[PDB]
Design a protein around this ligand. Structure first.
Ligand code: CLA
Ligand code: CLA
Ligand code: CLA
Ligand code: CLA
Ligand code: CLA
Ligand code: CLA
Ligand code: CLA
Ligand SMILES: CCCCCCCCCCCCCCCCCCCC(=O)O[C@H](COC(=O)CCCCCCCCCCCCCC)COP(=O)(O)OCCN
Ligand SMILES: CCCCCCCCCCCCCCCC(=O)OC[C@H](COP(=O)(O)OC[C@@H](O)CO)OC(=O)CCCCCCCCCCCCCCC
Ligand SMILES: CC1=C(/C=C/C(C)=C/C=C/C(C)=C/C=C/C=C(C)/C=C/C=C(C)/C=C/C2=C(C)CCCC2(C)C)C(C)(C)CCC1
Ligand SMILES: CC1=C(/C=C/C(C)=C/C=C/C(C)=C\C=C\C=C(C)/C=C/C=C(C)/C=C/C2=C(C)CCCC2(C)C)C(C)(C)CCC1
Lengths: 221, 105, 41, 732, 187, 80
């Protein structure tokens, strides 16, 4: 699963050999214990990351130019009625996602419209999609943070960064109303690789696979 | 109320003297008909780590620096008995000194 | 929350938690058990 | 060939629906599992015991969290006599608008459920005041449950699984468990009590932030290193004292006044502090007894083989018995379950008369539910103890290993034991029913003075010996000139005498002839249950109708219609028949307890005294009079908070009747009906495409008895709990 | 052959004497397994190192001069709050311990990060290992003593040393255990 | 399937094979009885455990013994 791991000293899962890119050994639940399932989940991760990148850059631009808050932007008035806006959005997506699904069925790439792959100028190379996957995952983490700072802080990303720069000792996640829960979660996440290490050390062989409802790895147990 | 150090020391010295000079010849005879050669003896054999824990310790069968068989374990046990008896006597003296009479009248 | 910081309960905690553990949890249990008992070999 | 029974390959070869039921029923019968050795069996039992411990700790952690979240523990702390405890909120989306309104009890907003478990009184007694402390308790118990689950996972890996001889270490396990699991555990309990609950009962808040800054006793451990332990009992709490404040209180941490608190109607906190301290000291002393790696100690086999009386009194005595108990896990399980059931019965008989929690005696339904719950738990544990003793007798019992000992001699004259048990059971039942019917008909003819009222003289004589002066017996500890009264006259006599001469509490109630008759009926129930369980245990391996019962396993249906008929011949069947008598006997004891205490709380003890003699009065004034509020839970004119109790009452009736459905009819008529249903499904349009993979077969006879007993007991327990709680809570 | 552990000549069964600081101290026999022996000698060495760091921090803080003692230093006003301290405190040392364990699984020794010998200055003598082990045991006993000072005497360790120096008889175990029940109220 | 065992107490009235409507039991020559016969169970996998041979057995205790357990599609008597 690549020489670089999700924590130092991790062992790759048996299904997660590292043939496909972006692999770091991070599979505790092992949703993708099937090649078709794994490639579908890679496609879904790429799409959620791409939409996350688009949303994050849109929020950054709108907060830089002074447009108002995005979670309150749905209550703002706009030209064209909202019902017919949803209607035309559904109508155009019933063609766009259809072409995407057919192209993924015949090719597997994440193309657009009638061009599969939609690469007109042509810099397709494995490091490019590696960088895209990394930036995409960082973008969904950023969008989750944006939603969190819209919920509890009630301010935009730029205002949250300004408050972090003004007083980083007391303006953070851990001094907020979600502070002690975040401390507990990060404590659990710090302990978590070490319990896995103890399971690997004491369970020297056998399988010790995580048997869960979402995967059929319990059949071999 | 009886002073604690003199009572505790006297009780534990009496119990240690009873254990060494009196109760020791009766000791190592009840155990000889308990863990002797032809009878029970060792409950385990010794192959694994969880099975060697029931084996006897290393410091309880070495030899007898005392002229009798009074070892460190016997010293600790009879000293515990002496501390128990001294604390019992001190507790009875304390209950008497509080004006409360435990005995039937 | 104040004086309730371990396992903070929201006000919508029963109205959300009861239908997963009466609806979704028995369904996952039923499906997992049915795939278990019917597994061949 | 399936693999859902992984422990049993043969069960996986069964193509019928019996595979799922037998796989679920023999899931943890590891001794009969395929390819299982002794050491792996013991390791699996260790892991399962850790899992049960984790489940118990998770359950009590959830109880703490639910009380801290949706309860009214602060309001109960402010006013225990007025505010009712709350167990959990009721979020049922099928509830109606009157249903939500009619369940906001205890001064709450949403629909909540009134707690009868008694944890409010217990937690107020041990010093828990704020719900923050209950939250910390819940998260700590969840953490320790996770720790126990990890430890159960820990002792299943290589280089961590203990050996077979580690489990068979008899002397050191007893030493360590007696010294630590009981001794320093009780010492830590009384230390926590003295540190927290004793100041919290006197208006002094003790917590993790300031327990190192406050002191339990003003003398400050100077009594302990000296001998002056009487300083700890110098200024106890006075009669005019409140449990929430320090009005007329004293600075004493270990006292022995005895009796009950005048306000809380419960035992004194310092009494329990000295009690657990003395128990801790005695258990730590007794835990240094058995032989370990050091040269001192006692060996169990030496004591067993030495205790053989001469002249052939017990034959070989207790020789050869150490290996019998050690090798057979069912012997240890039966002994443990017998002791656990006896202790549970003792607990039930001792919390009600001596309430250990503040304001527990005021909460009548709480005490009744606690008594009935622990009595039924004790009885089920008794039945399990006798069943597992029978399992020992059939599975692992070598007469050649222990020949001529107490076990072989008990098996030698087992017919005499069974016959004498049958004689005493028949005699008790015959005479008790004779006087009950006699007093029934005598009361029916309009002349109740002709009924046979045998006054209980032995138990009232004992009560006079224990200090009850109502009967006027000139006895020891009741007369001032007796040496028993003079001994302890200034220690705990004026508290115990004041508590036992007050009829308002539950300490040693006055007993009449009906009390004596119901006591002998209880003795009859215990005797008959003992008779059947003992006979099934002794006939578990051999009988004159079937000598080779040991070759057919513990739980087998029958031997056939030959030799006159061999239905219910197994010791498992003896257990299954004994559970009904157990249910009837505990029903009798709980009927007696509930009716006597209900008449005590209502103040009309004369009604119970003159009505418990004859069974018609028993029925009319217990099952009919107290059920008026029960069945009015959801009357068409009006509905109130007793709707769950009437619904649960009828639910218990329905499950009892389904138990009757499984109990009367037997498999063999059901197989033909299921065959006709098979022909119906297989041979119909639009449904022959859907076909079963497990063949539908009827429930096996052992399975039939088990499910009939399960529905029987579930319906019994639910309907009795519903009636008891509704009847006690409708009036008070 | 060894200086042994206590007077009586014990021929210890499992402890031959090749361990650093081996004296034969095992009256119950807890480490009969070799894997358990190596895991627990590594744990003993780490606990000794932590004990030395703890006691030296305590004496350095008391000698340098701080307004708040070591047993009350948790509840003190700092530049970073307790809520913002424990996330990175768990995270970075969980990283360190995970790297240490995943290296110790094959090396069998200690080590900060990657360079597991961790000896830029050398002098890795067995005498130094024995000195480290016994100095760690001494610091372990010292930290236990310090904790019991903070429990009973409610004072700093060097202050307790000064009290035993000024009045050796009148400040001993008997005085602070029986003669002074008012240690909570500022002695 | 079920386990059917015949002990040496058999003396050969050749009636336990008539009471079994499943052709489980067969009769082999022997020398330990007057009738020089002994019951045998070649098709022991076809037995359901109906114990009719036990009803037909006149010896005390019975020479033929049928032990339940490990049920299959033929020992359960299902035609489906
Ligand atoms: C003072 C003289 C004296 C006396 C009175 C006794 C008396 C006794 N010794 Mg003995 N003993 C003596 C001298 C004496 N010994 C000497 C010199 C030695 C040599 C050192 C011993 C060594 C010795 C040993 C080693 C043991 C005894 C034991 C016993 C007791 C049991 C006797 C027996 O065989 O069981 C009684 C005889 C029976 C046949 C048992 C019948 C029991 C029936 C069947 C049970 C009935 C149950 C019934 C339903 C209960 C109804 C109750 C209701 C509530 C339901 C008995 C009380 C044994 C013991 O500890 O037992 C307590 C024992 O192990 N003794
Ligand atoms: C409430 C119903 C009920 C009653 C009254 C009984 C009564 C009895 N059962 Mg029980 N039993 C019951 C339900 C009941 N059972 C149920 C539901 C089960 C679960 C299957 C069992 C399971 C069970 C077992 C497993 C055993 C018993 C046994 C007994 C006897 C115990 C001995 C005794 O108490 O003295 C006698 C008790 C009486 C109530 C006396 C009844 C006879 C009176 C005097 C009337 C006699 C007739 C009268 C003179 C009129 C004559 C004419 C008339 C015949 C037409 C007794 C006959 C035990 C036994 O028989 O061993 C000795 C035993 O081993 N029973
Ligand atoms: C929903 C988006 C999504 C999807 C579809 C995937 C899918 C995949 N990732 Mg990826 N990943 C994601 C988000 C996602 N990830 C995020 C946000 C991070 C950063 C934390 C990562 C970090 C990451 C690493 C470092 C690695 C992967 C890898 C993988 C592959 C195998 C792992 C697997 O089976 O999980 C399948 C996962 C899903 C189908 C989605 C998860 C299902 C839900 C969301 C979980 C339920 C909620 C749960 C409690 C989490 C909530 C978090 C909370 C804070 C909101 C698979 C192609 C591995 C790889 O490349 O293998 C080839 C690998 O090494 N991912
Ligand atoms: C700068 C960020 C970045 C990077 C490095 C990639 C990298 C990649 N994308 Mg992508 N792309 C991105 C953002 C990014 N994507 C965004 C935000 C969108 C939405 C507008 C798309 C829409 C998109 C389409 C429609 C297609 C790609 C394709 C590709 C491949 C080569 C073309 C390229 O470099 O662009 C490679 C997998 C092509 C492909 O199928 O590669 C598998 C393709 O057809 N991309
Ligand atoms: C094992 C004992 C136990 C039992 C019998 C119950 C029973 C109940 N809980 Mg509780 N619960 C428990 C432990 C327990 N809980 C623990 C340990 C926690 C802390 C994580 C919670 C947290 C909790 C919440 C937050 C809620 C309930 C709710 C409920 C009710 C509906 C069931 C439900 O949603 O599942 C509980 C759902 C969970 C996700 C908890 C699973 C915890 C696992 C075992 C770990 C029911 C009265 C709901 C309700 O309506 O309150 C009355 C509700 O909102 N429980
Ligand atoms: C802690 C004590 C303890 C222990 C360690 C055991 C352990 C054992 N017993 Mg014992 N037993 C106990 C208590 C105990 N039992 C008690 C209290 C009883 C009396 C009720 C029995 C009665 C008993 C019998 C009669 C037999 C055993 C057997 C066994 C073995 C396998 C049982 C098993 O796990 O199957 C797992 C079983 C199940 C998962 C079935 C659960 C169904 C339950 C019991 C019905 C409950 C009713 C209802 C559905 C509950 C829910 C309420 C509903 C409203 C939701 C095993 C050696 C059997 C044996 O040795 O094999 C030959 C055997 O024949 N025991
Ligand atoms: C076991 C190791 C250990 C631990 C847990 C502490 C912990 C502490 N020390 Mg200490 N310290 C230690 C070893 C240790 N020290 C050693 C070995 C020395 C040298 C002798 C010191 C010298 C020292 C001084 C001089 C002071 C502290 C202070 C502090 C506090 C804040 C320091 C901090 O994190 O700033 C952040 C640290 C970064 C590296 C960033 C905290 C209670 C300060 C305090 O408030 O005292 C109570 C203070 O003034 N310490
Ligand atoms: C019911 C009562 C609930 C409140 C009891 C006080 C506990 C409390 O507030 O603890 C805080 C957090 O403690 C903690 O977080 C303690 C963790 C152990 C402050 O406690 P603090 O850190 O200010 O404690 C100062 C010691 N002198
Ligand atoms: C092992 C030890 C256990 C503890 C034990 O046995 O302690 C023995 C005893 C303890 O005295 P205390 O009873 O006051 O100790 C407090 C107790 O509560 C705990 O030890 O020590 C002395 O009497 C020492 C007196 C020295 C007096 C020196 C006078 C010098 C004059 C010049
Ligand atoms: C089947 C079986 C079994 C089981 C059994 C059982 C289950 C039993 C039970 C039993 C029981 C359950 C018993 C009980 C007992 C009891 C007793 C024995 C008691 C006693 C008591 C006493 C002696 C007391 C006294 C006193 C006191 C101290 C105080 C007050 C007064 C008086 C005097 C009362 C086993 C496992 C073995 C195995 C084999 C078979
Ligand atoms: C060296 C030597 C010597 C000497 C010795 C001695 C002198 C000793 C002593 C000793 C003593 C003199 C003592 C001991 C002790 C021990 C022990 C081991 C103890 C214990 C104790 C205990 C255990 C206690 C307990 C308790 C408590 C804690 C509290 C409560 C009460 C009681 C009591 C229970 C000589 C010269 C001779 C010879 C040579 C050598």
């Amino acid at each position: 699963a690549g020489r670089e791991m999700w924590y130092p000293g991790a062992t790759p899962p048996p299904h997660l050999d590292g043939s496909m890119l972006g692999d770091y050994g991070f599979d505790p639940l092992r949703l993708g214990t099937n090649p078709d399932r794994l490639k579908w989940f890679r496609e879904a991760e790429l799409m959620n990351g791409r939409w996350a990148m688009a949303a994050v850059v849109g929020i950054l631009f709108t907060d830089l130019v002074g447009l108002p808050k995005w979670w309150e932007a749905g209550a703002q008035t706009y030209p064209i009625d909202n019902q017919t806006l949803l209607i035309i959005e559904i109508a155009v997506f019933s063609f766009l996602e259809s072409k995407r699904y057919e192209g993924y069925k015949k090719t597997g790439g994440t193309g657009f419209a009638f061009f599969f792959p939609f690469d007109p100028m042509g810099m397709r190379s494995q490091d490019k999609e590696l960088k895209e996957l990394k930036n995409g995952r960082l973008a969904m983490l950023a969008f989750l943070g944006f939603a969190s700072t819209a919920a509890v802080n009630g301010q935009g990303p730029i205002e949250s960064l300004q408050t972090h720069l003004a007083d980083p000792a007391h303006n953070n996640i851990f001094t907020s109303s979600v502070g002690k829960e975040s401390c507990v979660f990060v404590a659990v996440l710090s302990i978590l690789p070490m319990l896995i290490e103890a399971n690997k050390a004491l369970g020297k062989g056998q399988e010790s696979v995580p048997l869960f409802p979402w995967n059929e790895e319990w059949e071999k147990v | 109320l009886i002073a604690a150090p003199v009572a505790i020391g006297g009780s534990t010295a009496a119990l240690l003297a009873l254990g060494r000079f009196v109760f020791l010849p009766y000791q190592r005879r009840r155990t000889d008909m308990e863990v002797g050669p032809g009878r029970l003896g060792p409950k385990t054999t010794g192959d694994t780590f969880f099975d060697r824990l029931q084996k006897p310790a290393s410091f309880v069968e070495t030899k007898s620096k005392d002229p009798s068989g009074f070892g460190l374990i016997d010293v600790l046990g009879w000293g515990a008995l002496g501390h128990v008896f001294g604390y019992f006597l001190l507790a009875c003296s304390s209950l008497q000194d509080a004006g409360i009479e435990p005995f039937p009248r | 929350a104040t004086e309730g910081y371990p396992f903070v309960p929201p006000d919508w905690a029963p109205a959300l938690f009861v239908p997963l553990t009466g609806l979704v949890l028995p369904a996952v249990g039923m499906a997992w058990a049915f795939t278990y008992i019917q597994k061949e070999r | 060939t399936k693999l859902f029974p992984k422990f049993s390959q043969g069960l996986a070869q069964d193509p019928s629906t019996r595979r799922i039921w037998y796989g679920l029923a023999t899931a943890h019968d590891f001794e009969s599992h395929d390819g299982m050795t002794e050491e792996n069996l013991y390791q699996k039992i260790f892991a399962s015991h850790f899992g049960q411990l984790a489940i118990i700790f998770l359950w009590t952690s959830g109880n703490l969290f639910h009380v801290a979240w949706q309860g009214n523990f602060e309001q109960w702390v402010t006013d225990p006599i007025h505010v009712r405890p709350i167990a959990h909120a009721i979020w049922d989306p099928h509830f109606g608008q009157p249903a939500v309104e009619a369940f906001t009890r205890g001064g709450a907003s949403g629909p909540v459920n009134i707690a009868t478990s008694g944890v409010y009184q217990w937690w107020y007694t041990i010093g828990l005041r704020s719900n923050q402390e209950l939250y910390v308790s819940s998260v700590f118990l969840a953490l320790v449950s996770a720790v126990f689950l990890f430890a159960g996972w820990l002792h299943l890996q290589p280089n961590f699984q203990p050996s077979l001889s580690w489990f068979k270490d008899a002397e050191s396990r007893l030493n360590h468990h007696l010294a630590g699991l009981f001794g320093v555990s009780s010492l830590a309990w009384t230390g926590h009590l003295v540190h927290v609950a004793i100041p919290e009962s006197r208006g002094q808040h003790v917590g993790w932030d300031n327990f190192l800054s406050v002191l339990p006793h003003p003398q400050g451990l100077t009594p302990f290193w000296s001998g002056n332990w009487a300083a700890y009992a110098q200024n106890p709490d006075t009669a005019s004292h409140a449990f929430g404040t320090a009005d007329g209180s004293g600075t004493a941490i270990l006292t022995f006044l005895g009796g009950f608190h005048p306000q809380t109607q419960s035992l004194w906190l310092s009494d329990m502090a000295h009690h657990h301290l003395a128990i801790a000291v005695l258990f730590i002393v007794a835990g240094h007894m058995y032989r370990t790696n050091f040269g001192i100690g006692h060996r169990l086999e030496a004591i067993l083989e030495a205790h053989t009386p001469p002249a052939g009194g017990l034959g070989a005595g207790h020789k050869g018995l150490f290996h019998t108990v050690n090798n057979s896990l069912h012997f240890q399980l039966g002994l443990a379950l017998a002791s656990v059931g006896t202790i549970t019965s003792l607990v039930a008989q001792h919390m009600y008369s001596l309430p250990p929690y503040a304001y527990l005696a005021v909460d009548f339904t709480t005490q009744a539910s606690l008594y009935t719950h622990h009595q039924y738990i004790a009885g089920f544990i008794m039945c399990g103890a006798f069943a597992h003793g029978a399992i020992f007798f059939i599975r692992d019992y070598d007469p050649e290993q222990n020949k001529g000992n107490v076990l072989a001699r008990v098996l030698d004259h087992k017919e005499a034991i069974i016959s004498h048990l049958s004689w005493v059971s028949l005699f008790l039942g015959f005479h008790t029913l004779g006087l009950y019917v006699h007093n029934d008909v005598v009361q029916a003819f309009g002349t109740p003075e002709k009924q046979i009222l045998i006054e209980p003289v032995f138990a009232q004589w004992i009560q006079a010996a224990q200090g009850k002066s109502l009967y006027g017996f000139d006895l020891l500890l009741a007369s001032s000139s007796s040496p028993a009264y003079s001994a302890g006259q200034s220690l705990w006599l004026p508290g115990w005498l004041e508590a036992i001469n007050n009829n308002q509490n539950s300490l040693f109630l006055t007993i009449g002839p009906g009390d004596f008759l119901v006591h002998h009926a209880i003795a009859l129930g215990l005797h008959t249950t003992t008779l059947i369980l003992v006979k099934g245990a002794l006939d578990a391996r051999g009988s004159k109708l079937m000598p080779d019962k040991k070759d057919f396993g513990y739980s087998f249906p029958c031997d056939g219609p030959g030799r006159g008929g061999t239905c219910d011949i197994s010791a498992y069947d003896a257990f299954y028949l004994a559970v009904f008598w157990m249910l009837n006997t505990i029903g009798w004891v709980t009927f007696y307890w509930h009716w006597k205490h209900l008449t005590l709380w209502q103040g009309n003890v004369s009604q119970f005294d003159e009505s418990s003699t004859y069974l018609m009065g028993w029925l009319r004034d217990y099952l009919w009079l107290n059920s008026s509020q029960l069945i009015n839970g959801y009357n068409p004119f009006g509905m109130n908070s007793l709707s769950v109790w009437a619904w649960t009452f009828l639910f218990g009736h329905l499950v009892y009747a389904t138990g009757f459905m499984f109990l009367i009819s037997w498999r063999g008529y059901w197989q033909e009906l299921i065959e006709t249903l098979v022909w119906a499904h297989e041979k119909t349009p639009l449904a022959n495409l859907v076909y079963w993979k497990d063949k539908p077969v009827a429930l096996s006879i052992v399975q039939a008895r088990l499910v009939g007993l399960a529905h029987f007991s579930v319906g019994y327990i639910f309907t009795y709990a519903a009636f008891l709680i509704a009847s006690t809570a409708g009036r008070f | 052959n060894r200086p042994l552990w206590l007077p009586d000549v014990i021929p210890p069964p499992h402890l031959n004497g090749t361990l650093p600081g081996d004296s034969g101290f095992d009256p119950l026999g807890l480490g009969l397994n070799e894997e358990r022996l190596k895991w627990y000698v590594e744990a003993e060495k780490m606990n000794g190192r932590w004990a030395m760091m703890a006691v030296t921090g305590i004496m350095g803080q008391e000698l340098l001069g701080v307004p708040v003692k070591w047993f009350e230093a948790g509840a003190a006003e700092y530049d970073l709050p307790v809520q913002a301290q424990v996330p990175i405190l768990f995270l970075v040392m969980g990283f360190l311990e995970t790297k240490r364990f995943q290296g110790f699984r094959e090396t069998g020794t200690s080590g900060f990060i990657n360079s597991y010998p961790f000896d830029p200055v050398g002098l890795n003598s067995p005498k130094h290992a024995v000195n480290e082990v016994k100095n760690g045991r001494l610091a372990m006993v010292a930290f236990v003593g310090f904790a019991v000072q903070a429990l009973v005497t409610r004072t700093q360790p060097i202050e307790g040393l000064q009290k035993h120096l000024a009045d050796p008889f009148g400040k001993n175990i008997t005085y602070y255990l029986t003669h002074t029940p008012e240690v909570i109220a500022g002695t | 399937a079920h386990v059917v065992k015949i002990y040496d107490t058999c003396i050969g009235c050749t009636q336990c094979v008539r009471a079994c409507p499943l052709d489980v039991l067969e009769m082999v020559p022997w020398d330990g009885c007057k009738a020089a016969q002994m019951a045998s169970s070649p098709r022991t996998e076809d037995c359901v455990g109906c114990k009719r041979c036990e009803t037909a057995c006149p010896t005390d205790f019975l020479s033929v013994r049928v032990y339940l357990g490990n049920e299959s599609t033929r020992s359960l008597g299902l035609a489906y």
